[PDB]
Structures are given as structure tokens and as C-alpha cells.
Design a protein around this motif. Structure first.
Motif, PDB file in Angstrom:
ATOM      1  N   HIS A  56      -3.136   0.489  -3.716  1.00  0.00           N
ATOM      2  CA  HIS A  56      -2.414  -0.764  -3.895  1.00  0.00           C
ATOM      3  C   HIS A  56      -1.538  -0.571  -5.118  1.00  0.00           C
ATOM      4  O   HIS A  56      -2.059  -0.432  -6.220  1.00  0.00           O
ATOM      5  N   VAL A  57      -0.218  -0.529  -4.928  1.00  0.00           N
ATOM      6  CA  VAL A  57       0.700  -0.130  -6.011  1.00  0.00           C
ATOM      7  C   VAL A  57       0.728  -1.105  -7.183  1.00  0.00           C
ATOM      8  O   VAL A  57       0.774  -0.662  -8.315  1.00  0.00           O
ATOM      9  N   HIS A  58       0.703  -2.409  -6.911  1.00  0.00           N
ATOM     10  CA  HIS A  58       0.741  -3.427  -7.972  1.00  0.00           C
ATOM     11  C   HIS A  58      -0.592  -3.573  -8.727  1.00  0.00           C
ATOM     12  O   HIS A  58      -0.595  -3.870  -9.919  1.00  0.00           O
ATOM     13  N   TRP A  59      -1.706  -3.350  -8.037  1.00  0.00           N
ATOM     14  CA  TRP A  59      -3.041  -3.433  -8.628  1.00  0.00           C
ATOM     15  C   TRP A  59      -3.520  -2.108  -9.223  1.00  0.00           C
ATOM     16  O   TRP A  59      -4.559  -2.076  -9.884  1.00  0.00           O
ATOM     17  N   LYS A  60      -2.791  -1.023  -8.966  1.00  0.00           N
ATOM     18  CA  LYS A  60      -3.066   0.281  -9.581  1.00  0.00           C
ATOM     19  C   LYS A  60      -4.517   0.745  -9.396  1.00  0.00           C
ATOM     20  O   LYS A  60      -5.161   1.286 -10.290  1.00  0.00           O
ATOM     21  N   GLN A  85      -9.569   3.777  12.821  1.00  0.00           N
ATOM     22  CA  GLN A  85      -9.287   4.703  11.717  1.00  0.00           C
ATOM     23  C   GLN A  85      -9.417   4.023  10.354  1.00  0.00           C
ATOM     24  O   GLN A  85      -8.932   2.903  10.167  1.00  0.00           O
ATOM     25  N   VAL A  86     -10.060   4.712   9.409  1.00  0.00           N
ATOM     26  CA  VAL A  86     -10.194   4.233   8.034  1.00  0.00           C
ATOM     27  C   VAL A  86      -9.334   5.087   7.104  1.00  0.00           C
ATOM     28  O   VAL A  86      -9.380   6.330   7.149  1.00  0.00           O
ATOM     29  N   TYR A  87      -8.573   4.407   6.247  1.00  0.00           N
ATOM     30  CA  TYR A  87      -7.663   5.056   5.314  1.00  0.00           C
ATOM     31  C   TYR A  87      -7.947   4.626   3.885  1.00  0.00           C
ATOM     32  O   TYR A  87      -8.220   3.456   3.615  1.00  0.00           O
ATOM     33  N   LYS A  88      -7.874   5.599   2.985  1.00  0.00           N
ATOM     34  CA  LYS A  88      -7.765   5.373   1.549  1.00  0.00           C
ATOM     35  C   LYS A  88      -6.301   5.038   1.255  1.00  0.00           C
ATOM     36  O   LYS A  88      -5.417   5.828   1.563  1.00  0.00           O
ATOM     37  N   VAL A  89      -6.054   3.868   0.674  1.00  0.00           N
ATOM     38  CA  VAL A  89      -4.709   3.450   0.258  1.00  0.00           C
ATOM     39  C   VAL A  89      -4.679   3.114  -1.234  1.00  0.00           C
ATOM     40  O   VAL A  89      -5.668   2.641  -1.782  1.00  0.00           O
ATOM     41  N   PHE A 141       0.805  -1.226   0.000  1.00  0.00           N
ATOM     42  CA  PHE A 141       0.000   0.000   0.000  1.00  0.00           C
ATOM     43  C   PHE A 141       0.835   1.271   0.000  1.00  0.00           C
ATOM     44  O   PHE A 141       1.979   1.261   0.436  1.00  0.00           O
ATOM     45  N   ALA A 142       0.236   2.367  -0.473  1.00  0.00           N
ATOM     46  CA  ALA A 142       0.866   3.694  -0.463  1.00  0.00           C
ATOM     47  C   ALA A 142      -0.161   4.829  -0.373  1.00  0.00           C
ATOM     48  O   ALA A 142      -1.366   4.606  -0.494  1.00  0.00           O
ATOM     49  N   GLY A 143       0.336   6.044  -0.172  1.00  0.00           N
ATOM     50  CA  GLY A 143      -0.493   7.247  -0.158  1.00  0.00           C
ATOM     51  C   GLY A 143      -1.584   7.246   0.893  1.00  0.00           C
ATOM     52  O   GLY A 143      -2.697   7.698   0.619  1.00  0.00           O
ATOM     53  N   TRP A 144      -1.256   6.763   2.093  1.00  0.00           N
ATOM     54  CA  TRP A 144      -2.236   6.579   3.178  1.00  0.00           C
ATOM     55  C   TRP A 144      -2.885   7.924   3.492  1.00  0.00           C
ATOM     56  O   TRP A 144      -2.184   8.906   3.704  1.00  0.00           O
ATOM     57  N   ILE A 158      -8.910   0.659   4.130  1.00  0.00           N
ATOM     58  CA  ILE A 158      -8.461  -0.185   5.245  1.00  0.00           C
ATOM     59  C   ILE A 158      -8.898   0.450   6.562  1.00  0.00           C
ATOM     60  O   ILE A 158      -8.616   1.624   6.805  1.00  0.00           O
ATOM     61  N   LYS A 159      -9.610  -0.328   7.380  1.00  0.00           N
ATOM     62  CA  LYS A 159     -10.060   0.095   8.704  1.00  0.00           C
ATOM     63  C   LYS A 159      -9.135  -0.553   9.741  1.00  0.00           C
ATOM     64  O   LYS A 159      -9.206  -1.764   9.972  1.00  0.00           O
ATOM     65  N   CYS A 160      -8.273   0.261  10.354  1.00  0.00           N
ATOM     66  CA  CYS A 160      -7.340  -0.200  11.396  1.00  0.00           C
ATOM     67  C   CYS A 160      -7.961  -0.156  12.783  1.00  0.00           C
ATOM     68  O   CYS A 160      -8.828   0.677  13.058  1.00  0.00           O
TER      69      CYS A 160
END
Ligand code: 2V9
Ligand code: CL
Length: 264
Positions: free
Chosen positions: A30-34, A24-28, A13-16, A39-41
Motif C-alpha cells: 500500500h503506497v500511501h500507508w508504506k 490467488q493471494v498476493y503480497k501488495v 497498491f503496488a509490487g504485486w 489480497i486474496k482475489c
């Protein structure tokens, strides 16, 4: 059920970017899936075996309910402990209702789609009770189509407004499909008014007590653009929040009526 779910390493993942709050919920990305995911932590520091098993239970419940109107789940992150899910660009109904006045055709379609998703859950064998249905957990895609999320409390704070009166009457009653039907009533109320229920009120305890005796959010007036459909929806809402759970409609009956609100 849990065979198709993937384990994600945080390096995938990137760009959290925070969107949430619970956890906490984040927009990530997925670098390989473009593509982007959500993700809810966990909110805690030490993620014990109780949480990690509950998180797996949450994921398995979501996977069993694969449907057009239910939020897809992809798997779990272990690095930070989190549930990995589809990203819904437009966010929640709660945020949408507070932003600007919505056209009535969209309001009716949101209600209907929410109802069709709920109906799918209750059609499973055995039925899946959501038990946390509220505008905050009704997510919207780029074209404002509904997908139901948050299966944290599902079974095979601000939540008091969505709580059925029988849950206040009886010390630990058994959960049933009529619980979700009540919560849906209060969702209809929010869609009709664009307000949060019992927002003006001082203390919860007085209103809760009145809710046990039959008190509900104040009925909205009939709207000018779609008065007939609006009246019908107000009526359905009222049946859905009846004090007697057995008088409330099933989602089979609800979806049949909400469908007619959409078709012209
Ligand atoms: C906490 C919350 O953050 C916002 C809305 C939210 O439901 C709170 O109102 N929120 C967003 C705000 C803006 C864009 C996206 C989201 C979003 C997403 C999810 C969730 C989600 C899944 C399970 C429990 C809570 C979740 N949220 C999500 C959420 C899961 N999929 C998402 O895209
Ligand atoms: Cl009309």
C-alpha cells in the motif's frame, strides 16, 4: 461490522507478488500507508453478486473476531475483486512443517496459540465455527506467532484428512464446535510429525471408510528432547480425534492443557 471496512482501489497498491494457491493471494505494498498487505482475489472471470456478497460475509466474520490470534481484515478491493488482509511474512504452517525440523518449544507454542485463537471463536455469542482449520490456514508472522486465516467456510481436495468421521457417516449433519476440535487433532498430528496426514496412501475412499470405523494417522513415537510434554500432547490429540463428538474436549479444556506444555 462492515462499517469500519474500507474499499480499496487497485491504484492504492503496488509490487504485486504471488504467494497463494481456490483464489490467488498476493503480497501488495500500500503506497500511501508504506506497509505491505495481503489480497486474496477470486479465481473466476465474471464475479457475480453471489461471490461479492459472500466475500463481504467473509470479511464481516473476520472483523467480528478481532483478536491477537485471528488474522486482521482491512476491507475489499473492487477493481480486482479481492479481500484485503494483514500480511504474514513467514507464510503457512504447512510450508514451515515441510521446510526444516522445528524446535519442540516452538511446536508447543504454535499448537497453544492456534488453540487460543480457536477458543476465542467458540467463545463468541453465538459461536463462530471455523470449519476449514488446517496447517495451510494457520499463518505465521516474522517471529513465528500464529494468526488463524481463511474464514471462507465459517458459520454462525486435500481437506478429507481434516473432515470429522460424523460428516462421512451422516448425509449433511449440522455443523458444531466438535468439528473444529477434530481438525485441530489432525493439526497436532502434523506438528508432531512434520508430515502431511495420509500422504503415503493410494485412494481416499478406503481410508475415509476406515476413519468412520475409528482409523487415524499412525501415532508418532515419543521424542527424545521433550518426552513428557510430547506424551501429553499425543494423549490430547487422541481425545480430540475420538469417533464420538461428545467425548472430545472443548477448546476451553484444550487451551488449559496446551498452556502447561509451554510453561517449561
Ligand atoms: C492460499 C494461501 O496462500 C498462502 C497460504 C495459503 O493459505 C495456502 O496454503 N499464503 C501466504 C504465503 C506466504 C506469505 C503470506 C501468505 C498468505 C496470506 C494470507 C493467505 C490467505 C487468506 C485466505 C485464504 C488463503 C490464504 N493463503 C494466504 C497466504 C493472508 N495473509 C497473508 O499474508
Ligand atoms: Cl518434557
Amino acid at each position: 461490522a462492515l462499517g469500519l471496512l474500507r474499499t480499496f482501489d487497485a491504484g492504492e497498491f503496488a509490487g504485486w507478488e504471488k504467494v497463494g494457491s481456490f483464489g490467488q493471494v498476493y503480497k501488495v505494498r500500500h503506497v500511501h500507508w508504506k506497509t505491505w498487505l495481503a489480497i486474496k482475489c477470486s479465481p473466476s472471470l465474471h464475479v457475480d453478486d453471489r461471490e461479492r456478497m459472500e466475500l463481504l460475509e467473509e470479511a464481516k466474520k473476520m472483523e467480528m473476531a478481532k483478536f491477537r490470534y485471528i488474522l486482521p481484515v482491512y476491507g475489499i478491493c473492487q477493481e480486482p475483486v479481492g479481500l484485503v488482509m494483514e500480511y504474514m511474512e513467514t507464510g503457512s504452517l504447512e510450508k514451515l512443517l515441510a521446510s526444516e525440523p522445528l524446535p519442540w518449544d516452538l511446536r508447543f507454542r504454535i499448537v497453544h496459540e492456534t488453540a487460543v485463537g480457536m477458543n476465542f471463536l467458540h467463545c463468541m455469542s453465538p459461536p463462530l465455527l471455523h470449519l476449514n482449520l488446517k496447517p495451510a490456514n494457520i499463518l505465521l508472522d516474522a517471529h513465528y506467532h500464529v494468526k488463524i486465516s481463511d474464514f471462507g467456510l465459517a458459520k454462525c481436495f486435500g481437506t478429507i484428512a481434516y473432515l470429522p468421521p460424523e460428516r462421512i457417516r451422516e448425509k449433511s449433519r449440522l455443523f458444531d464446535t466438535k468439528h473444529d476440535v477434530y481438525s485441530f487433532a489432525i493439526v497436532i498430528w502434523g506438528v508432531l510429525t512434520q508430515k502431511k496426514p495420509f500422504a503415503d496412501e493410494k485412494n481416499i475412499l478406503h481410508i475415509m471408510m476406515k476413519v468412520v470405523k475409528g482409523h487415524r494417522p499412525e501415532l508418532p513415537p515419543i521424542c527424545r528432547p521433550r518426552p513428557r510434554a510430547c506424551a501429553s500432547l499425543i494423549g490430547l490429540m487422541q481425545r480430540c480425534w475420538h469417533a464420538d463428538p461428545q467425548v472430545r474436549p472443548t477448546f476451553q479444556e484444550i487451551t488449559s492443557e496446551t498452556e502447561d506444555l509451554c510453561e517449561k
